[PDB]
Structure formats: structure tokens, C-alpha cells
Design a protein around this ligand. Structure first.
Ligand SMILES: N[C@@H](CCC(=O)N[C@@H](CS)C(=O)NCC(=O)O)C(=O)O
Ligand SMILES: N[C@@H](CCC(=O)N[C@@H](CS)C(=O)NCC(=O)O)C(=O)O
Lengths: 203, 203
């Protein structure tokens, strides 16, 4: 079957959730981001040269990387499941827009906080940016249905919620954005999110 | 017709190039990233709340944002032009992978260098990362055809080349990566890249 290379709590949790949401079959492979060795003790850089998670391995034995692409690939395995607007629809671009936005403007923003060697100057700048970005998300949430896409829960929601998960832990205060806070609890309350989190040990 | 909001030399140059490559019709709208006012003097934040370029405005009058999504949307207007593997093909995921990778691991990496207020600590870290990333790109170039996708020139190439354009200007030395250097000259020599650059004033 398919193999997901992940690190507990990492952005690889997003596709982990999606696999469950879509009801797909998969094995989890734990990766040590320190020594780029897998649980089995294999060399992870052989799997993903870029040397990060998530990495998805298909039966062809081919490997896919880049969280937001992996999420797309997974959703397309089960269009039946509607985790993504149908092909040819313009709504689909809106979702891609969200996945792109999340990827560059939010995921990457946490860079400094994850670097043992980052100035506080930069961690201060990151927060500032992170804050401007969350203002947008809060506005959009204020304008829209329960999920990023509105009424339809989609892959963007697993990505966005996973990533914002990191705040309580980096002790970043979200009080300022209540809708976002509600949104997060909304995501975490999903039985598939539960299942993945429990499976990853986050509970 | 379609309206592209850009800043000369910015990541908005990528879709600018693509519009020409695909032979699409469009008007350029210059944006002042300082005062978020357009050339016409309109309020750019009305166009893109997130307040960055590129932003693409369709006839529906709808607006699309996120460089790598815009590039996809443009390529799909003219599948005829092959700036992107066909739908349903797995090669297409490879391209998306490249667009994602470029977006997060390369475009965003230049963050510090564009911030009047960034420590040198962070600019040092950025280079380090940027360097690791370029090693990968060089390897892949060493393994592959002339373009990111090999023989097929695609939207990833307009994105990647546009972004690396910034080095000579931020005086970042690419000597270390000759293939990349060749690749850049390869991109810039394309009559459509020329045309966009001239049109943006970069020549
Ligand atoms: N753009 C990549 C970024 C991947 C990424 O930043 N992964 C983190 C986990 S949240 C990681 O494994 N970092 C460890 C490393 O880069 O060595 C993606 O979205 O897949
Ligand atoms: N993730 C966004 C990033 C856009 C971006 O960083 N644009 C830059 C130009 S290279 C910009 O207009 N920055 C000015 C600002 O953010 O105020 C995208 O790819 O479209």
C-alpha cells in the first residue's frame, strides 16, 4: 500500500488526517528529523532528497513531496469524498489558492520559531507577519461558512488546522482571533482528526 | 480582458511571462507596494486584501492570487500550449511539486533580504537554506533535461527563473551552481521572457 513518512505533530499530520478522512489505506513511517533515519533505520534522504516530511510513497514506489501537493493527490484518489471542488470548476482554484496561501504565508512563517538558531529579531518579525496573515483568515472566517471553503470541509482545513496547532505549543496566543480558535476546535473535534492525533501520540 | 497587478521584477513577472508564452490577452496594472495604490491611483487592497502581487483579475471581475495558482490557471486556459502536463497524468503532480517547492523553499526564503528590518543573523540563515535548496535544484538539473520538467518547458520554469533573477540584484553569488546559471540564461533568452522584461522595464 501507500507509505507516509511523518513526524508527530509536523505538517505531515495534515495528509495523515486526509488519508483517514478519505478512508484510504496506508502505513505510517516515522522519520527522525535529526538523523534523517526512518523508524526501520533506513536512510530517509534516499526517500526524500530535500530531507523533510511529509513524503508519500506510492505502490509504483514513487515518492511525492510537498504537503499541499500530496493533499491534492490524496483527494483525487477519492473524488467521491468531496475533500476538494471537482476538476474544471472554478471553486477548485479557490481551494488551491487556500493551499498555496497556507503553504507560503503561514506554514513557512513559523520558520524562525522552529530554528534553534534564530535571532529574536526574526521571531519578532515572524509574529508580526503571522499576525497580519491571521487577520485575513479571521476576516474570511467571519465572512464564510464553518470551513475555509465555507460549508464544504476540504483538505485546506486539515492543512491550516494542523499548522496552527503549533501555537499552543510555541506558546503563541491566538486570543486575538476567536473565530480562528473556534475553527481549530472544530477541526480537532472531527473523529478522523482525533484518530490521526491519537495515532501520532498527540493525545 | 484580464488584468495583471504586478511590480516590476517581482514574482508577478512569472505569470507575466506565462501570459506571453501562452499568447493570452491582458492589461498590466502597476502596483505601488509602498502605498498599495495602483497606477490608476485605486486602492490595491480592495483588489487583493492580502496586499501583495501578483493578483490576476478575470472578466467575471473575480480576482485570483498566489503566484503558483495563477500560473496554473493561466496554463489551463491554453492546454493547447503544453506549459503543463495534461490533467489526469501523474507527470502533472511532478510539476505541481515543483511549483510548491519553488513557492515555499525558494521564493519565501528570500524573505529576510527583502525586509529593510531583518537581522543579518537571519540573512545569514536564509543564505544557508537557500544554498541547500539550490544544491537540490542543481542535482536535479544535472539529472534532467534543459528545463525543470526536462524537455518540456513549463510554468515552473518561469517561476523559478523569475525568482532566482533576484540574486544578481541582492548580489547573491550563484557561481557555486553553474547549471543553475546556465538555466537562468536559458530562460532569459526566450523571446517571451525578453518581451515581458522589456515591458516591465528590466532591460
Ligand atoms: N514545503 C515543504 C516544507 C516541509 C517542511 O517544512 N517540513 C518540516 C516539518 S513541519 C520538516 O520535516 N522540517 C525538517 C527539515 O527541514 O529538516 C512542504 O510543505 O512539504
Ligand atoms: N505567497 C504569495 C507571496 C506574494 C509575495 O511575496 N509578493 C511580493 C512580491 S515578490 C510582494 O508583493 N510583497 C509585498 C508585500 O507583501 O507587501 C504569492 O506567491 O503570490
Amino acid at each position: 500500500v501507500m507509505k507516509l513518512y511523518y513526524f508527530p505533530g509536523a505538517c505531515s499530520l495534515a495528509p495523515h488526517i486526509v488519508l483517514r478522512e478519505a478512508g484510504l489505506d496506508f502505513e505510517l513511517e516515522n522519520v527522525d528529523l535529526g538523523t534523517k533515519k526512518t523508524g526501520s533505520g533506513a536512510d530517509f534522504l534516499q526517500v526524500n532528497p530535500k530531507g523533510y516530511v511529509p513524503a508519500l510513497q506510492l505502490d509504483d514506489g514513487q515518492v511525492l513531496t510537498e504537503d499541499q501537493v500530496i493533499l491534492q493527490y490524496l483527494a483525487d484518489l477519492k473524488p467521491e469524498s468531496g475533500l476538494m471542488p471537482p476538476s474544471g470548476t472554478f471553486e477548485r482554484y479557490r481551494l488551491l489558492e487556500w493551499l498555496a496561501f497556507i503553504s507560503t504565508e503561514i506554514h513557512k512563517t513559523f520558520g524562525p520559531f522552529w530554528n534553534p538558531e534564530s535571532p529574536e529579531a526574526s521571531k519578532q518579525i515572524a509574529l508580526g507577519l503571522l499576525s497580519r496573515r491571521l487577520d485575513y483568515v479571521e476576516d474570511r472566517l467571519e465572512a464564510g461558512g464553518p470551513w475555509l471553503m465555507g460549508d464544504r470541509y476540504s483538505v485546506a482545513d486539515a492543512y491550516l488546522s494542523t499548522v496552527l496547532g503549533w501555537c499552543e505549543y510555541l506558546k503563541i496566543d491566538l486570543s486575538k482571533w476567536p473565530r480562528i480558535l473556534a475553527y481549530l476546535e472544530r477541526n480537532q473535534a472531527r473523529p478522523a482528526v482525533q484518530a490521526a492525533m491519537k495515532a501520532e501520540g498527540l493525545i
